[PDB]
Design a binder for this molecule. Structure first.
Ligand SMILES: Nc1ncnc2c1ncn2[C@@H]1O[C@H](COP(=O)(O)OP(=O)(O)O)[C@@H](O)[C@H]1O
Ligand SMILES: [Mg+2]
Lengths: 888, 67, 48, 67
């Protein structure tokens, strides 16, 4: 082969093939093979070519030489071929095709299930099956993790994984194709996705089906290895956008589906109109490709019916979602003589309060000029046009959060029929991707933050955990660090210790009533100033702009009104009215009012609480990564931007990860397990007498004549290089297969004999049945049978003694049940009176402690007042003594 | 088998509920030990502060007697 | 290493394959003799 | 019936064993709260002692300046 052939950088293709002519100092003269153009590069710039045999090769671990340009070229050729999957040692990378392909069937599912990776081409089914088999064998918990940016395709991987699980994990009822009748819980699970997508996804510049929320599914197994339950967790969503729509972006799909899909009957029931009739709908109607809004409206409702919804609990959702849509039409105009808001379009408010089943008069005045309780007093709040707007928008957010919470609880309660027992579980994580547009507020930052924090978690588990394990076992190994680290950026945002990060400063300046978002950004600039990952305003200090560094590039942020996001202010009067709504559904949604704020908990701290919990689950479980790659930002099939895939691959750290995978020892097993699993291969060499099993392992490894570079012997674990144990296992099983077939023939023989013997009993039974039926069938047309049928009931069977005996027998049983019921009643009565007395005592004691608390707290306040008084008098005395001392 | 399922479910639920209580015991014991260390530290602070106070009073009285 | 282990294995396996081949030749000739015996039996039965 | 007897015995024994653990939780929580009160009391002692010390130093410096 021509050793002068090399990959040279390209503005269009990232890298492209070229040929070296000559070299000079630190440089090489080369000619591009596409056009014959001469150019000079540094000896550090160019990369070694992928040989013909390695073109489109499978696992990156198998490459003759690790080159970014070779990987890029293999990826591009595979994307042109349409084989989207490629392995990277322990994990897999994929790329969004933007077009449907027949890579999925029951035949493929059955082909993959239970087979080893080495015997098969790449597929997500293989990853799902491997996680399932390892979960079953090791009896530990496992997880599947899809990662990539907003357009990168995660939802298609997730859709395939839960579908695979919903067939492979199913228990058999004893009762072939994709129309197969799955179990009740699998049937709910497969409908949960389209349900949640409708309510939770929207169109963005990045993705037409962009999830506004993060989610985690898990499925629970029994000791046999079959599914017995499931759970669907869902995290905080980008709820702000829904009534503040940027150009060509859409609200939640359900809104468009309702407005388009509703019948005239439904439209009148809900008091709805067509598009562009709503103040909350900026840009008006916005289109979306491939969807059919009416048909989608039908199928989502039908999905809810399959999820066991009544017609009332469907229409009630339609009523509340109509209410948030309509309430935007409550338009305000300010009275210049008083600066208070007024409502010329009171018709809108009347429609809204009707749909909510509350009083129009109170609803109108609680928005325009509310009376709010502030400590001891209940006082008339002065209320501007802007404050009224803010109040109704906040009410819309509250209604939306309550309805989404109801949906998520309702879908989980469908699954919650199952029992609390389980052996282990398999998780599926699906967080919304890296995302950016013309505005960057807090609502995007939390998602972008968790995306990068997940990559930092990967850095630990992939790189650091290995060195720790090798050091623990004390094996012959040498440390290396390629410097993948995000920690300073995490520390800039979070506050585990001082100095205070972004979240802590935002909460602190939010709590102080004199402070504002300008105060927040000023404090951030002053306290974080020259931090390696922080950057001050782009001269636009008046805009309160600031910036932070991320592996996905530096991002500039806009701090406007972040304080209202942390504070979550809401109107107490309308909350009280809605809590006591005429509609039972709305009253249930608004039953809890303890998060009312007329000015509690910080959104950052709330987010941290759920984050640490899920991350602890990710630390306990064994994850399986499946990385997805964005081909282009124009949402186009076939087209691929080299620089996008290059930089995504780079920041994912795959070139570094694959190196340590091949360089180190990925397989590892305890010595006793290694011996007990493979002893058959050295049973004549291994001594029968009791000793350290590692000696027996050494003897076996010597008998196999393995190269000492392929393994390392620790004190407990023996480490091995990729796949050797699985091939030894195959060989060992093949050694056993011959006798297994002989035994299988015997067992199948026994089964056949049993079946045949049963068939003989069935045959003899059938023969006597046939004799009887034929005999009757021949004769039943004879006339005398009618007379026999008239006469027999007058003569035959005395009956009454048998009846009496039966009644007496059942009477004894009923008397026994009575005795037991009366005993149970007495037991419950004894416990009832005890609990009643304990309740009485606790109530009395509680009232006493409440009185004592009141007495203590009032005197505490009094003493604080006297302390302040004495301190003020002392200040006056210090001033006096100074005046005396100056005079003396 | 149904009796087994029921009794095993009961056993599982009752076990996990009280295992959470055992975790609360572990947390309570950790907090107890932490507060015990805090008590010892604060006692050392009181020792030093009181000694410093008494020394300050001694010096005050000495200087007052010298004036 | 794998190639060396295989080289050793091929030498052993060829010798054993010769043994197996010989065993099949013996069983072939035994089955042929059985065929002749049962053919004689069939002729005797036909004559009878 | 034997399965019932065994599972019921196991449930009873495990329940009483973990109820003893719950009593240990109650004791641990009581001790925790007691030590928490002790920490607050000692913190108040440190407050008063430190304030008294600083006042003594102020008076010392004042008198030293007056002499
Ligand atoms: N494996 C796949 N097969 C077919 N189309 C795919 C596949 N993966 C992604 N796509 C295409 O990509 C589009 C967007 O991908 P999506 O799953 O929405 O990405 P993300 O969840 O990262 O936003 C889909 O509408 C679909 O056309
Ligand atoms: Mg998605």
């Amino acid at each position: 082969s021509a050793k002068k052939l090399v990959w040279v950088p390209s503005e269009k293709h990232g890298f492209e093939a070229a040929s070296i002519k000559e070299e000079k100092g630190d440089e090489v003269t080369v000619e591009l093979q596409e056009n014959g153009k001469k150019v000079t590069l540094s000896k550090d710039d160019i990369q070694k070519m992928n040989p013909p045999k390695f073109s489109k090769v499978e696992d990156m671990a198998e490459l003759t030489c690790l080159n970014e340009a070779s990987v890029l070229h293999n990826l591009r050729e595979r994307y042109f071929s349409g084989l989207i999957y490629t392995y990277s040692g322990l994990f897999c990378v994929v790329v969004n095709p933007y077009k449907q392909l027949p890579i999925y069937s029951e035949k493929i599912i059955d082909m993959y299930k239970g087979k080893k990776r080495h015997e098969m081409p790449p597929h997500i089914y293989a990853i799902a099956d491997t996680a399932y088999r390892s979960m079953l064998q090791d009896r530990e918990d496992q997880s599947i993790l899809c990662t990539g940016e907003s357009g990168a395709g995660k939802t298609e991987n997730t859709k395939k994984v839960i579908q695979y699980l919903a067939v492979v994990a199913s228990s058999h009822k004893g009762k072939q194709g994709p129309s197969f009748s799955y179990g009740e819980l699998e049937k709910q699970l497969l409908q949960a996705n389209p349900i949640l997508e409708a309510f939770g996804n929207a169109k963005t510049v990045k993705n037409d089906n962009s999830s506004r929320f993060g989610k985690f599914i898990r499925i629970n197994f029994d000791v046999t290895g079959y599914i017995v339950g499931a759970n669907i967790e869902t995290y905080l969503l980008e709820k702000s956008r829904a009534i503040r729509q940027a150009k060509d972006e859409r609200t939640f799909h359900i809104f468009y589906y309702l407005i388009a899909g509703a019948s005239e009957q439904m439209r009148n029931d809900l008091l709805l109109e067509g598009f562009n009739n709503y103040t909350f709908l900026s840009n008006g109607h916005v289109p979306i490709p491939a969807q059919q809004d009416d048909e989608m409206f039908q199928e989502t409702l039908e999905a809810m019916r399959i999820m066991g919804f009544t017609e009332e609990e469907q229409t009630s959702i339609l009523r509340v979602v109509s209410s948030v849509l309509q309430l935007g039409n409550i338009v305000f105009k300010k009275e210049r003589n008083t600066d208070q808001a007024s409502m010329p379009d009171n018709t809108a408010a009347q429609k809204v309060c009707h749909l909510m089943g509350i009083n129009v008069t109170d609803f109108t005045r609680s928005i325009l000029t509310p009376r709010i309780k502030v400590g001891r007093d209940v006082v008339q709040k002065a209320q501007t046009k802007e404050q009224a707007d803010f109040a109704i928008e906040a009410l819309a957010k509250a209604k939306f959060e309550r309805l989404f919470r109801w949906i998520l609880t309702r879908v989980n309660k469908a699954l919650d029929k199952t029992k609390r027992q389980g052996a282990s579980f398999l998780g599926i994580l699906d967080i919304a991707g890296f995302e950016i547009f013309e505005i960057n507020s807090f609502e995007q930052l939390c998602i972008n933050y968790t995306n990068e924090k997940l990559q930092q978690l990967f850095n630990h588990t992939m790189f650091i955990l290995e060195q720790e394990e090798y050091q623990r076992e004390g094996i012959e190994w040498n440390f290396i660090d390629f410097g993948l680290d995000l920690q300073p950026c995490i520390e800039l945002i979070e506050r585990p210790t001082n100095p205070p990060g972004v979240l802590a400063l935002l909460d602190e300046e939010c709590w102080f009533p004199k402070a504002t978002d300008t105060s927040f950004v000023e404090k951030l600039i002053q306290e974080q100033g020259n931090h390696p990952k922080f950057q001050k305003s782009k001269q636009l200090k008046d805009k309160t702009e600031f910036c932070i560094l991320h592996y996905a590039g530096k991002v500039s942020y806009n701090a406007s009104a972040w304080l209202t996001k942390n504070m979550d202010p809401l109107n107490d009067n309308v909350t009280s009215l809605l809590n006591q709504s005429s509609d039972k559904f709305v009253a249930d949604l608004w039953k809890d009012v303890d998060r009312i704020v007329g000015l509690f908990r910080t959104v950052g701290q709330l987010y941290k609480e759920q984050l640490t919990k899920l991350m602890t689950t990710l630390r306990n479980t064994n994850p399986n990564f499946v990385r997805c790659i964005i081909p282009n930002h124009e949402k186009r099939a076939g087209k691929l931007d080299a620089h996008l895939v290059l930089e995504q691959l780079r920041c994912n750290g795959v070139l570094e990860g694959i190196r340590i995978c091949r360089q180190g020892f990925p397989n590892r097993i305890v010595f006793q397990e290694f011996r007990q699993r493979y002893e058959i291969l050295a049973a004549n060499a291994i001594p029968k007498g009791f000793m350290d099993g590692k000696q027996a392992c050494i003897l076996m490894i010597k008998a196999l004549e393995l190269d000492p570079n392929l393994y390392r012997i620790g004190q407990s674990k023996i480490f091995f290089r990729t796949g050797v144990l699985a091939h030894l296992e195959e060989e060992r099983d093949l050694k056993i297969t011959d006798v297994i077939i002989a035994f299988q023939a015997q067992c199948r023989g026994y089964l056949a004999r049993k079946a045949f013997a049963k068939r003989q009993q069935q045959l003899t039974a059938m023969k006597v049945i046939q004799r009887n039926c034929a005999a009757y069938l021949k004769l039943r047309n004879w006339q005398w049978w009618r007379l026999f049928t008239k006469v027999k009931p007058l003569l035959q069977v005395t009956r009454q003694e048998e009846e009496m005996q039966a009644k007496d027998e059942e009477l004894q049983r009923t008397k026994e049940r009575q005795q037991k019921a009366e005993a149970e009643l007495k037991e419950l009565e004894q416990k009832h009176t005890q609990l009643c007395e304990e309740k009485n005592l606790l109530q009395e004691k509680l009232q006493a402690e409440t009185e004592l608390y009141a007495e203590a707290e009032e005197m505490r306040v009094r003493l604080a007042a006297k302390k302040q008084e004495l301190e003020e008098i002392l200040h006056e005395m210090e001033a006096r003594i100074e005046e005396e001392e100056e005079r003396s | 088998e149904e009796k087994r399922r029921q009794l095993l479910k009961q056993l599982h639920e009752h076990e996990t509920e009280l295992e959470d209580e055992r975790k609360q015991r572990a947390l309570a014991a950790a907090a107890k030990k932490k507060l015990e260390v805090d008590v010892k530290d604060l006692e050392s602070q009181v020792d030093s502060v009181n000694k410093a106070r008494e020394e300050a009073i001694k010096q005050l009285r000495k200087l007052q007697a010298q004036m | 290493s794998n190639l060396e282990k295989k080289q050793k294995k091929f030498d052993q396996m060829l010798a054993e394959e010769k043994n197996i081949s010989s065993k099949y030749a013996d069983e072939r000739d035994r089955a042929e003799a059985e065929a002749r015996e049962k053919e004689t039996k069939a002729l005797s039965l036909a004559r009878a």
